[PDB]
Amino acid sequence: DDLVGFKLFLPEGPCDHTVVKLQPGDMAAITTKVLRVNGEKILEDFSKRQQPKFKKDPPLAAVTTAVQELLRLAQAHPAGPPTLDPVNDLQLKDMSVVE
Known part of the structure; x- marks a missing residue:
């Protein structure tokens, strides 16, 4: 189950979110799916x-929508x-990679 594709992680707790600055090597894959969510607003939210005093603000609709979209995508x-x-999908031609 772990060596066939990429086991889609389903979070065992409530579906929270973080926004992290990831390196290319820490990201497993660039998925084909296109969710036209607004990154600027999600960052500005x-x-x-993430102020410790304002960590308990009500969620914004774009952020909640993105989190829900990711969780269902896992599902x-x-x-x-x-x-x-x-x-x-990227139209490359290395033969060795096809093999």
């Missing part, structure tokens, strides 16, 4: 809320959604 794919394939 997360960074605002919505049996073994992991396709990544933006180097060959079949």
Whole structure:
């Protein structure tokens, strides 16, 4: 179950969120799915809320929507959604990679 595709993690607790500055190597895959969510507003909401005194503000609709979208996406794919394939979506031509 762990060596076939990427086991889509389903959080065992409540579906919270963080916004982290990730490196390319810490990110497993670039999924093909396109969720046209507004990053600017999500940043202008997360960074605002992460004041310890204002950590308990009511969630913003864009942030809640993104969190819900990610959680269902984890639920919505049996073994992991396709990544933006180097060959079949990014149009590359290395033969060794096909092998």
